[PDB]
Coordinates of C-alpha atoms and ligand atoms in Angstrom, one line a residue:
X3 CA -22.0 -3.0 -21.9
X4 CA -22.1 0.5 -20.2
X5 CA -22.7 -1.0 -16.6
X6 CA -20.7 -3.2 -14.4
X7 CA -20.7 -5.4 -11.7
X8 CA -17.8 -5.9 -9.7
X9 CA -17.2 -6.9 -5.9
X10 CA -15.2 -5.6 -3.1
X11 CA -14.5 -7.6 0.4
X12 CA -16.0 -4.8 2.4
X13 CA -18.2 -1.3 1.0
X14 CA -16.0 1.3 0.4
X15 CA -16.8 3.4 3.4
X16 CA -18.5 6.7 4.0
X17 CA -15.6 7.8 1.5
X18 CA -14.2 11.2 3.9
X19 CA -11.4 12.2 1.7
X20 CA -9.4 13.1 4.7
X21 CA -9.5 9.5 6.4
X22 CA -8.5 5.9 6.5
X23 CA -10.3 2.7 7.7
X24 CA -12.8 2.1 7.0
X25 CA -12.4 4.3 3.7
X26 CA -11.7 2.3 0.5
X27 CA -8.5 4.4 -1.5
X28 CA -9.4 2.7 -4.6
X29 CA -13.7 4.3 -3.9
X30 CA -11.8 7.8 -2.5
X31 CA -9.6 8.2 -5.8
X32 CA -13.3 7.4 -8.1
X33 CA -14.8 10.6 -6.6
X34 CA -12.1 12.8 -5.1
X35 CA -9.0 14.1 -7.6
X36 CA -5.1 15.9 -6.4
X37 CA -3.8 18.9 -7.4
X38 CA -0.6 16.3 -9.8
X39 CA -1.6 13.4 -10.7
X40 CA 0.8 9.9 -10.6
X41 CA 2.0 8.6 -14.1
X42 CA 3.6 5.6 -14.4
X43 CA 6.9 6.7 -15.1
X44 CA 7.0 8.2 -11.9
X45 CA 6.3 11.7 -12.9
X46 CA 3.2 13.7 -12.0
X47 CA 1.4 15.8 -14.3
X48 CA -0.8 18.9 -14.0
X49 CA -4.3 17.8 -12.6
X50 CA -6.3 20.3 -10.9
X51 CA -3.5 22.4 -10.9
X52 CA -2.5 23.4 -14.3
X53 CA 1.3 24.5 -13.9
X54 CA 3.3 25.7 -10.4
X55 CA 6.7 26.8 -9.6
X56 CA 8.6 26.8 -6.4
X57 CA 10.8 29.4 -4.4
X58 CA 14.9 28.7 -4.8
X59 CA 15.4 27.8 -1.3
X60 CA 12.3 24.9 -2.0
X61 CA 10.2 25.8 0.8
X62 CA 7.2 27.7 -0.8
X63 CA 5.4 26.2 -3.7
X64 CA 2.5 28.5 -5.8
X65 CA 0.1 26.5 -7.7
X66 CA -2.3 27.5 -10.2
X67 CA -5.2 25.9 -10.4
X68 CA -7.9 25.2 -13.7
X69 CA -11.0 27.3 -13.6
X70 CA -13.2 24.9 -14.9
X71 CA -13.5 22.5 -12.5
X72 CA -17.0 21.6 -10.4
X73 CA -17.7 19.9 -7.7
X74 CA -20.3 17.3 -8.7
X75 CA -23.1 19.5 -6.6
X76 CA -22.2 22.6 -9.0
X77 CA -20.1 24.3 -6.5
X78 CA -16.9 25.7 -7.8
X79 CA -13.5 23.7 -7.2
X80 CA -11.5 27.4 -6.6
X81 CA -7.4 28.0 -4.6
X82 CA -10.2 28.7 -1.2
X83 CA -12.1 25.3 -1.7
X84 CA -8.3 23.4 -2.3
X85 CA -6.8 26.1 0.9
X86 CA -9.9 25.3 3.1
X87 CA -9.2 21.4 2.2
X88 CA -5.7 21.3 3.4
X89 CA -7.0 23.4 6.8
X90 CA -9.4 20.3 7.1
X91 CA -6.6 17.8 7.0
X92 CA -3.9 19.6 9.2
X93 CA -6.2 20.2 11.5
X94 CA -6.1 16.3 12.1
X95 CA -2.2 16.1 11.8
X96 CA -1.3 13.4 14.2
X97 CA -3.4 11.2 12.2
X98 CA -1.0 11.9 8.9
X99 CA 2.1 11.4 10.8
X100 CA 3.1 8.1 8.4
X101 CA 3.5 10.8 6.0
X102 CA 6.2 13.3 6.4
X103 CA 4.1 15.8 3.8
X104 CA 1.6 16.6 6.9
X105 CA 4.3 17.3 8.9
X106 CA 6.1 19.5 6.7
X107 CA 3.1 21.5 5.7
X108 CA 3.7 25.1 7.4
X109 CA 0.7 27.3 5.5
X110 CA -1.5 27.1 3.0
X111 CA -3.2 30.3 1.1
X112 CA -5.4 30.9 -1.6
X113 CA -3.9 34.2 -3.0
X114 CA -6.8 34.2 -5.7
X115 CA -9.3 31.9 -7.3
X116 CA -6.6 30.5 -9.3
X117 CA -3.3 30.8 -7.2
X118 CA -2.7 28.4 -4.2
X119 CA 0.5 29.3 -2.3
X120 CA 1.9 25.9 0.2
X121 CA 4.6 26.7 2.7
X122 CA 6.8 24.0 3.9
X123 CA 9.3 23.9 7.1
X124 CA 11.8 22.4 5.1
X125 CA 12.8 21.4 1.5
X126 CA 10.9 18.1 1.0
X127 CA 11.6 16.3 -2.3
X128 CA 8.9 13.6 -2.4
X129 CA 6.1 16.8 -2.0
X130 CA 4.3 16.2 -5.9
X131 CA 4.2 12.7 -4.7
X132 CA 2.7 13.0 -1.9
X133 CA 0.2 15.3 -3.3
X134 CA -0.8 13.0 -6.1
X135 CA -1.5 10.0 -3.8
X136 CA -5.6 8.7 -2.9
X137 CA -5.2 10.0 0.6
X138 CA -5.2 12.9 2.6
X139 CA -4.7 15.4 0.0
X140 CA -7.8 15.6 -1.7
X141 CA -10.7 17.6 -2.4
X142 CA -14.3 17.9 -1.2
X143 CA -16.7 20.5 -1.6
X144 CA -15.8 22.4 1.5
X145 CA -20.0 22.8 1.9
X146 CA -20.0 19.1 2.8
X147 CA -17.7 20.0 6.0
X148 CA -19.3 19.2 9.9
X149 CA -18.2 22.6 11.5
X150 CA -16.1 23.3 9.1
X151 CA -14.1 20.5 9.6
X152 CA -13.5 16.8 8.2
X153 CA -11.7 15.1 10.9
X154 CA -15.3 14.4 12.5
X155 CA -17.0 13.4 9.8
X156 CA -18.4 14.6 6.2
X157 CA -22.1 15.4 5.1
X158 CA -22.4 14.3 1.3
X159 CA -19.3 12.9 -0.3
X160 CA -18.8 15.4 -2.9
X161 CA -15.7 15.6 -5.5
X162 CA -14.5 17.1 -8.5
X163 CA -14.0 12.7 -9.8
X164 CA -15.2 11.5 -12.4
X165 CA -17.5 9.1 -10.4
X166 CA -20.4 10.0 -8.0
X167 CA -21.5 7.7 -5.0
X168 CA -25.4 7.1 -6.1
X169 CA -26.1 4.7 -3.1
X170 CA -24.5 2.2 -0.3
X171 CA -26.0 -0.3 1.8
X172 CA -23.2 -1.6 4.5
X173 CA -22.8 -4.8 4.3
X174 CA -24.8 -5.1 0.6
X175 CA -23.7 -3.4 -2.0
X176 CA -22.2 0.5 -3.0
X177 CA -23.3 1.7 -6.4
X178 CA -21.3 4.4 -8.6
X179 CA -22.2 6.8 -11.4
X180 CA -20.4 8.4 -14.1
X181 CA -20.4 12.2 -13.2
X182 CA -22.3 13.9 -16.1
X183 CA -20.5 17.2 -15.5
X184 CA -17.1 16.2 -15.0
X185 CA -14.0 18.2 -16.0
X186 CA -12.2 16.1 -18.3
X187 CA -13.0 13.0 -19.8
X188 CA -15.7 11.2 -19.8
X189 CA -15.9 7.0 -18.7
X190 CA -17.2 4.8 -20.9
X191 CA -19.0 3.5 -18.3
X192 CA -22.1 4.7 -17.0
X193 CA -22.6 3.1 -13.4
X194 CA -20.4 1.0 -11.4
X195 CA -22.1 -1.2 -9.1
X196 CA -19.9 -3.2 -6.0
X197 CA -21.3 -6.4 -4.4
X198 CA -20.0 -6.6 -0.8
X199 CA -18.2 -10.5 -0.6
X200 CA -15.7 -11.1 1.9
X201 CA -14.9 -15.0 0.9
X202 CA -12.7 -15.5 -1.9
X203 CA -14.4 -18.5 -3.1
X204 CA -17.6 -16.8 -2.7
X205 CA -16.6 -14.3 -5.0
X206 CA -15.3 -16.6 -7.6
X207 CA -18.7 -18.2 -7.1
X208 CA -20.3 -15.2 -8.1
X209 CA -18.1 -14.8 -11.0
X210 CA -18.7 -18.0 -12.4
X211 CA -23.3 -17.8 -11.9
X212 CA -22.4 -14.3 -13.5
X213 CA -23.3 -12.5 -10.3
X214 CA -20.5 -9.7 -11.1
X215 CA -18.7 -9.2 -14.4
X216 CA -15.1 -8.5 -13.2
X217 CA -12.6 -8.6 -10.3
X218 CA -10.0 -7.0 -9.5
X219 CA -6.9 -7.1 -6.9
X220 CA -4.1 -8.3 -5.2
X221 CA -3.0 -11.8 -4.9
X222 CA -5.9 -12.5 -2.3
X223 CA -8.9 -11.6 -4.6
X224 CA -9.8 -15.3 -5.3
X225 CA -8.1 -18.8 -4.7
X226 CA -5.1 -19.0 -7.2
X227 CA -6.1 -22.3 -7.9
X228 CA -9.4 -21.3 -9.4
X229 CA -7.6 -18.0 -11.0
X230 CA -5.2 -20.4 -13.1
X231 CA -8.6 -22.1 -13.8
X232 CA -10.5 -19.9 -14.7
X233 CA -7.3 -18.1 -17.3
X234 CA -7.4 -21.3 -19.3
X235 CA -11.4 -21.3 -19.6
X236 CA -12.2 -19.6 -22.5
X237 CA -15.5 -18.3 -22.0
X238 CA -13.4 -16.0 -19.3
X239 CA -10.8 -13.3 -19.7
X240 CA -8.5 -13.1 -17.1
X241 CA -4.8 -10.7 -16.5
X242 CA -1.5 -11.2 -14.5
X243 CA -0.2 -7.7 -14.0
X244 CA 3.7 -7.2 -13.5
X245 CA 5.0 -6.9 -9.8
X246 CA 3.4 -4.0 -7.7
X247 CA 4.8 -4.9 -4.5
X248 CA 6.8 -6.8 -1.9
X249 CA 5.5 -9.8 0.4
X250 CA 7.8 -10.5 3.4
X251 CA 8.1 -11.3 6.7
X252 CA 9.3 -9.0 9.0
X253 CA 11.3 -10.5 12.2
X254 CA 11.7 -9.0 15.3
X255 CA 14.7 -7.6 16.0
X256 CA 13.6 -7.1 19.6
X257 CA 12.8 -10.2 20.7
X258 CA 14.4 -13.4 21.4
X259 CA 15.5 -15.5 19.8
X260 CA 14.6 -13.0 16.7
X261 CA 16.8 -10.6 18.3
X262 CA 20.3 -12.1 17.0
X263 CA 21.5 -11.4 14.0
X264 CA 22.7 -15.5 12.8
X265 CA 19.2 -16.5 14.0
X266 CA 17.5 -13.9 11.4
X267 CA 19.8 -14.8 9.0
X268 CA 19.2 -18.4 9.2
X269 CA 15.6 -17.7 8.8
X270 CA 16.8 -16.3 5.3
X271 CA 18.2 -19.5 4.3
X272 CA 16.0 -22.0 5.3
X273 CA 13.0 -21.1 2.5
X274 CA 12.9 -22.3 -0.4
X275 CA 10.3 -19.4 -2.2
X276 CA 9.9 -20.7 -5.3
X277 CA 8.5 -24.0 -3.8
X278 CA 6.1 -21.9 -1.5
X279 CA 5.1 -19.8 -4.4
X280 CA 4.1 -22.8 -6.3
X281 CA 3.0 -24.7 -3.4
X282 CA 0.7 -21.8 -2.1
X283 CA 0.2 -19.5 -5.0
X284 CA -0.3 -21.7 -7.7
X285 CA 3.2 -20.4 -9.1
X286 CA 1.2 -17.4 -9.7
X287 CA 3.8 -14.8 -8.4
X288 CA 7.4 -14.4 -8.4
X289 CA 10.2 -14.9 -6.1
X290 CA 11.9 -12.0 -3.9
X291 CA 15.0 -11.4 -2.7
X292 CA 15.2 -7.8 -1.7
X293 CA 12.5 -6.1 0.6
X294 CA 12.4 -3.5 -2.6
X295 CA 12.1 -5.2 -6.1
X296 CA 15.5 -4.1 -7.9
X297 CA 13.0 -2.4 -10.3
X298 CA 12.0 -0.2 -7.6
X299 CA 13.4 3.4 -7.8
X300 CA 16.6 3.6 -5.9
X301 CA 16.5 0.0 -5.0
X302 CA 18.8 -1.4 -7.6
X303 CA 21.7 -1.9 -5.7
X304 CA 23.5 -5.3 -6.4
X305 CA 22.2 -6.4 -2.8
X306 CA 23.3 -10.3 -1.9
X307 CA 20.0 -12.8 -2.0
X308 CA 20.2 -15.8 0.5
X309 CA 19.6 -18.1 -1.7
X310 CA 17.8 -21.3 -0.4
X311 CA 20.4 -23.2 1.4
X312 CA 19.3 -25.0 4.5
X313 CA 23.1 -26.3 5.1
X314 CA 24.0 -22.8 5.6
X315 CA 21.2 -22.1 7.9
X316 CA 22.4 -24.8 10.3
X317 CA 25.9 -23.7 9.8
X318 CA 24.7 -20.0 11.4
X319 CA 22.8 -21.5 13.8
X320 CA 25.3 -23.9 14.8
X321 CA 28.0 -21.3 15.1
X322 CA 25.4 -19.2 17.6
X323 CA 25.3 -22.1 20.0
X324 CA 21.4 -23.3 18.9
X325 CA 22.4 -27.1 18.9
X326 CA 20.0 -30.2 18.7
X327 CA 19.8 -31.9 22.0
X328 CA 19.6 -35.9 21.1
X329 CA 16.7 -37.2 20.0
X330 CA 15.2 -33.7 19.1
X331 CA 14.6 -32.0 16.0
X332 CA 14.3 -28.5 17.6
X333 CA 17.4 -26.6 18.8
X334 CA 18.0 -25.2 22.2
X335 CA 20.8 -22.5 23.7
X336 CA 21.6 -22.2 27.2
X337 CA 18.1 -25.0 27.5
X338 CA 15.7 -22.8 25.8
X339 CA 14.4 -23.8 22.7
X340 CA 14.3 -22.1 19.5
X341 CA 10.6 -21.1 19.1
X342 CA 9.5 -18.1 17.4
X343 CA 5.7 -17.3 16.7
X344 CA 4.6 -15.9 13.5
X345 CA 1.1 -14.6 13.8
X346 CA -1.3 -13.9 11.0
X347 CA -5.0 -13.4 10.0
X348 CA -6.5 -16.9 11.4
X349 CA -9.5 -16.9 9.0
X350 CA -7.1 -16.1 5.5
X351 CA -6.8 -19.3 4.3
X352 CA -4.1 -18.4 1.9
X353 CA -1.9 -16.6 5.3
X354 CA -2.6 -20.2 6.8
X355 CA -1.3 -21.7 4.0
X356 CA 1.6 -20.0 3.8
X357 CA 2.0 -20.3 7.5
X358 CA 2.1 -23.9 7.6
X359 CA 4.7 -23.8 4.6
X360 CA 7.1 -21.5 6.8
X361 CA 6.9 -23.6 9.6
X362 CA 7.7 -26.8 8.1
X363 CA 10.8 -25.2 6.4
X364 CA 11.9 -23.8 9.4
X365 CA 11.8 -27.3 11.3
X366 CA 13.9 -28.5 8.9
X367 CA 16.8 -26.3 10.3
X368 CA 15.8 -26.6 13.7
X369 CA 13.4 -24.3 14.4
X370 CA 10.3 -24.3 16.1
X371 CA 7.7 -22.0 14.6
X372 CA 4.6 -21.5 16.5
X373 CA 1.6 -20.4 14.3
X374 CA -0.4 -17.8 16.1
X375 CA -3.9 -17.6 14.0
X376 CA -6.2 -14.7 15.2
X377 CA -8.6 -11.7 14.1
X378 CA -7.5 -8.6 12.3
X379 CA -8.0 -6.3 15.4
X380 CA -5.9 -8.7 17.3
X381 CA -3.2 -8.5 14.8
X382 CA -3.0 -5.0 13.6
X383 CA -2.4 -4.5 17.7
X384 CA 0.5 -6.6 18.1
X385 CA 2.3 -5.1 14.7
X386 CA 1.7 -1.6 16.2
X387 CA 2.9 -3.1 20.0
X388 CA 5.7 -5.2 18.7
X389 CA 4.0 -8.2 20.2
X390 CA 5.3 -10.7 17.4
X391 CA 8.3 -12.8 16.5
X392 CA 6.8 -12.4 13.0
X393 CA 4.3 -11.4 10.3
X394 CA 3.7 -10.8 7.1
X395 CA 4.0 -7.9 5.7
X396 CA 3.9 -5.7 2.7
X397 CA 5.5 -2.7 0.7
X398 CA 3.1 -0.3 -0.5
X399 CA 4.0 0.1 -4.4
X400 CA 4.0 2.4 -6.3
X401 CA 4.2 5.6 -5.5
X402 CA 4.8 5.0 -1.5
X403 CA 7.8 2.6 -2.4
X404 CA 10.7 3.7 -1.5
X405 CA 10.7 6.9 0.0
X406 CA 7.3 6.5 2.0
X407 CA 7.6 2.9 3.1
X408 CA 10.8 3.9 4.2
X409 CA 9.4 7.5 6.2
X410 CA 7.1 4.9 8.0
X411 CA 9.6 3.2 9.8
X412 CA 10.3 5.9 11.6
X413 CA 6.7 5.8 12.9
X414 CA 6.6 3.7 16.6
X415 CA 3.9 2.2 16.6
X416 CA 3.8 0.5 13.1
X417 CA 5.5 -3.2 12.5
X418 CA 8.2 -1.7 10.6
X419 CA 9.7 0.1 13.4
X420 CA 8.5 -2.3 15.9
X421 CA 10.5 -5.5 13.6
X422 CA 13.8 -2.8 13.4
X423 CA 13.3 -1.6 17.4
X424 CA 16.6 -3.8 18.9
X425 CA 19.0 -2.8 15.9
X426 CA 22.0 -1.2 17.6
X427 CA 21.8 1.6 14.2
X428 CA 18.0 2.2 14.4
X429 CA 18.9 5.9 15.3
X430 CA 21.2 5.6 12.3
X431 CA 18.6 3.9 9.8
X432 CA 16.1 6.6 11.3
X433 CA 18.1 10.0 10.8
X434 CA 18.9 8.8 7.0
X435 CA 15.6 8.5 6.8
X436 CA 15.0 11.9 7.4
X437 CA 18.0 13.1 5.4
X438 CA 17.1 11.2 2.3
X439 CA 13.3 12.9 2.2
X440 CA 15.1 16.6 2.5
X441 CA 18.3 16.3 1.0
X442 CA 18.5 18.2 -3.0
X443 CA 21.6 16.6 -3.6
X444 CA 20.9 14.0 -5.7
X445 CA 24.3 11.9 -5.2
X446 CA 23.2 12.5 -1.1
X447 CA 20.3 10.8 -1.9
X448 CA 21.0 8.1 -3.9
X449 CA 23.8 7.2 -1.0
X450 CA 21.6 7.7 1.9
X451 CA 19.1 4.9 -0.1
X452 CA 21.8 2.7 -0.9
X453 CA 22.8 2.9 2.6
X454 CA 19.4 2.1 5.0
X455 CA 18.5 -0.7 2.1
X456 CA 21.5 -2.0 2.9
X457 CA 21.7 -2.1 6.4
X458 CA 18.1 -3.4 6.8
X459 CA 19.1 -6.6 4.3
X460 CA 22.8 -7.0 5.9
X461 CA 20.7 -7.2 9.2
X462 CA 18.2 -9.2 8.0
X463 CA 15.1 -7.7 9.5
X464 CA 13.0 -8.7 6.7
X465 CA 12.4 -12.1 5.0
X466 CA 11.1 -11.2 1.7
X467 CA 9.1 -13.9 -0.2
X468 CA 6.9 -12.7 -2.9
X469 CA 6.7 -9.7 -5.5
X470 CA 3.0 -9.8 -5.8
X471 CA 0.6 -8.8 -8.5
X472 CA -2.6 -7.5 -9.5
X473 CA -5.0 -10.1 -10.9
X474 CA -8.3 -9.3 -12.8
X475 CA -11.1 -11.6 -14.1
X476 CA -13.7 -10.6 -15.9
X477 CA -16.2 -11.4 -18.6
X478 CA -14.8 -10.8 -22.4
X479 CA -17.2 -8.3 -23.4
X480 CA -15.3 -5.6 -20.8
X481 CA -12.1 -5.7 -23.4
X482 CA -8.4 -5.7 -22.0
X483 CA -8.6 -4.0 -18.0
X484 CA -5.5 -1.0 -17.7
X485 CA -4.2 -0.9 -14.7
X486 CA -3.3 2.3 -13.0
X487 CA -0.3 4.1 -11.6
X488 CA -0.9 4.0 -8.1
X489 CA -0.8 0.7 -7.1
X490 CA -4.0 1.3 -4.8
X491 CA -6.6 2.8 -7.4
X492 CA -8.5 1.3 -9.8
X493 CA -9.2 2.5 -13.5
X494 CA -12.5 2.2 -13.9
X495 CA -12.3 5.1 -15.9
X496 CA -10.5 3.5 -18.8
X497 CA -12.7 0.7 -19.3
X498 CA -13.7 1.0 -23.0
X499 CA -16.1 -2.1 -23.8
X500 CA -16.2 -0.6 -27.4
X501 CA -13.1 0.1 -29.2
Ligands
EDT601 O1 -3.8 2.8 6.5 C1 -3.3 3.7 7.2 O2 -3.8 4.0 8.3 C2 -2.1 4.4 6.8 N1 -1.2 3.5 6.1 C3 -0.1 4.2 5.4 C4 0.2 3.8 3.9 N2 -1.0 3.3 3.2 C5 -1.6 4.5 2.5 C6 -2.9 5.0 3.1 O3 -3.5 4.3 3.9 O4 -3.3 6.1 2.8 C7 -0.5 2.4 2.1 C8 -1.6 1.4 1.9 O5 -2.6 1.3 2.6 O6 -1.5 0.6 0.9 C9 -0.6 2.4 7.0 C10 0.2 2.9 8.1 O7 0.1 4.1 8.6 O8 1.0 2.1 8.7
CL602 CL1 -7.7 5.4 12.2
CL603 CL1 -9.7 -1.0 5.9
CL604 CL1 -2.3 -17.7 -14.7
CL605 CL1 11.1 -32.1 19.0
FE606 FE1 -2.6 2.4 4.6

């Protein structure tokens, strides 16, 4: 085949390079392309930039740029189109602000057609990285700006990508095209079209009538009881990537009774993951003990697990003064009981499950755990409020993890800092943060990493459960599926049917 069929739980947006929701990354990295592009070993590599170099004191940076490159209307990709680009983006800076980059960006100045010149106020290591990733720093067809600007909306969404948005229909379907006149190579596949199905069974269901031809995602693209089905059916191929990321809970550290330190670490002690993961996910995933894989640059760090050990989690509590009053099974200090919500998605059926797994490990030391189920605006306000006990969470994978999951706590109204708000050495964990992102000295760095990680496990702000992966399904005649580098993209690029 030279067409697909695949399926998304929402379309992919009216894909502005320069914006978020409801932009898809994995639809904003198929049309629009960075300056370095992410490799796997956590290099970049020359993209639309072909070489660069950088000032001694690291603070100016001159790229220059390939002269070949179109935009998929014709128009040339040139150091004004890339300058006029970042303009767009800084000119919406408080938007970035998860990303130290946008902050750090002083100037940026097409010197020629092929020379693009990027000031920064201070010496910021992850800078390649942060140019490589699917969002803000990439490239339209500065033609397609609304009075001259982005941060209001685009006209046609036009990049230098190998794929071109044909057509979308919200709510139905979005449908892709190879770009004919792309710069370098050229997909195997011709047109890429994306049925819009929300449901995870419904798009299993699809898969199976052979509605679509693959799927592709996290750990919640289909029921993991029908994925382990469906890799032992022969007619179907189906993949298990390796780890991309972290799921947790994150506990706040503001809030009673989530605000002392022997409750959180009880919390720690009273799961046993590798019975949720099997209960839950089908034993489809793998255990975590650290809120960063010890895989994860940086990360490897000899940090202590808390092994399952409910003994010890009464123990803590026990020695805190949460005791069982007679003829209860929930604990109580100075007569308040220990209750802690954990609220989550209501209608994710997998969160739910879960959910009801967490709480009845909990009861078994003594804790009450109150499930609060509601809708995704109701709960992306209380993680930026700190209205939770807990949530689930994530880590962002590769490239954001470390360094950028870690910029992002120092962001207010995000769960991260909202979970760490009531740590006596949040100022601490925060200016380490911002040393570690500037600092040169590679020993510095490596310190200042070893030291937040280890303060956020010692303190247990997280309860890490899960180092998820990416799951595909598809029908045999696609070949083997590559996954990419950036956790958050999808190579449709490198599908080769015919090899
Ligand atoms: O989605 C956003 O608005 C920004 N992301 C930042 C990290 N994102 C990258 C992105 O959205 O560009 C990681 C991710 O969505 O996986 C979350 C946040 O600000 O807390
Ligand atoms: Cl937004
Ligand atoms: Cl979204
Ligand atoms: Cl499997
Ligand atoms: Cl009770
Ligand atoms: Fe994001």
């Amino acid at each position: 085949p030279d067409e697909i069929t695949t399926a998304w739980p929402v379309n992919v947006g009216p894909l502005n390079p320069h914006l978020y929701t409801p932009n898809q990354m994995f639809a904003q990295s198929m049309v629009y392309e960075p300056l370095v592009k992410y490799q796997a070993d956590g290099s970049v590599i020359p993209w639309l930039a072909k070489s660069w170099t950088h000032s001694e004191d690291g603070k100016t940076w001159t790229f220059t740029l390939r002269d070949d490159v179109k935009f998929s209307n014709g128009e040339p990709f040139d150091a004004e189109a890339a300058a006029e680009n970042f303009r767009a983006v800084l000119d919406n800076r408080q938007r970035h602000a998860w990303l130290e980059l946008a902050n750090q960006i002083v100037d940026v100045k097409a010197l020629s057609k092929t020379e693009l010149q990027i000031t920064l106020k201070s010496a910021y290591y992850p800078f390649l990285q942060e140019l490589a990733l699917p969002r803000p720093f990439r490239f339209i067809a500065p033609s397609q700006f609304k009075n001259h600007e982005t941060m209001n909306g685009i006209k046609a969404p036009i990049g230098t990508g190998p794929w071109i948005l044909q057509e979308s229909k919200l709510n139905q379907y979005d449908v892709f095209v190879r770009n004919e006149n792309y710069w370098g190579e050229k997909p195997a596949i011709k047109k890429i079209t994306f049925n819009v199905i929300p449901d995870p069974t419904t798009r299993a269901v699809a898969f199976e009538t052979g509605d679509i031809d693959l799927l592709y995602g996290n750990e919640g693209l289909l029921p993991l009881d029908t994925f382990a089905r469906f890799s032992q059916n022969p007619a179907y191929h189906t993949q298990l990537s390796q780890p991309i990321e972290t799921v947790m809970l994150a506990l706040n550290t503001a809030k009673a009774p989530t605000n002392e330190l022997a409750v959180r670490e009880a919390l720690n002690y009273a799961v046993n993951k590798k019975s949720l993961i099997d209960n839950a996910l089908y034993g489809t995933q793998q255990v975590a003990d650290t809120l960063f894989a010890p895989s994860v640059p940086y990360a490897n760090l000899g940090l202590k697990p808390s092994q399952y050990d409910p003994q010890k989690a009464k123990a803590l509590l026990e020695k805190a003064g949460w005791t069982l009053p007679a003829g209860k099974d929930i604990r109580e200090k100075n007569g308040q009981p220990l209750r802690i919500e954990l609220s989550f998605i209501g209608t994710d059926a997998l969160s739910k499950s879960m959910a009801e797994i967490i709480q009845a490990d909990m009861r078994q030391i003594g804790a009450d755990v109150s499930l609060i189920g509601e809708e995704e605006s109701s709960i992306y306000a209380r993680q930026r409020d700190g209205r939770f006990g807990m949530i689930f969470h994530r880590t962002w994978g590769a490239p954001y993890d470390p360094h950028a999951f870690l910029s992002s706590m120092r962001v207010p109204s995000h769960a991260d800092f909202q979970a760490q708000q009531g740590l006596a050495d949040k100022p601490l964990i925060d200016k380490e943060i911002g040393e570690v992102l500037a600092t040169h000295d590679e020993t510095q760095r490596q310190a200042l990493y070893r030291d937040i990680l280890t303060r956020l496990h010692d303190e247990a702000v997280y309860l890490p459960i899960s180092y998820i992966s990416m799951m595909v399904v598809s029908k045999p005649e696609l070949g083997n599926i590559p996954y990419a580098p950036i956790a958050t993209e999808i190579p449709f690029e490198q599908i080769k049917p015919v090899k």
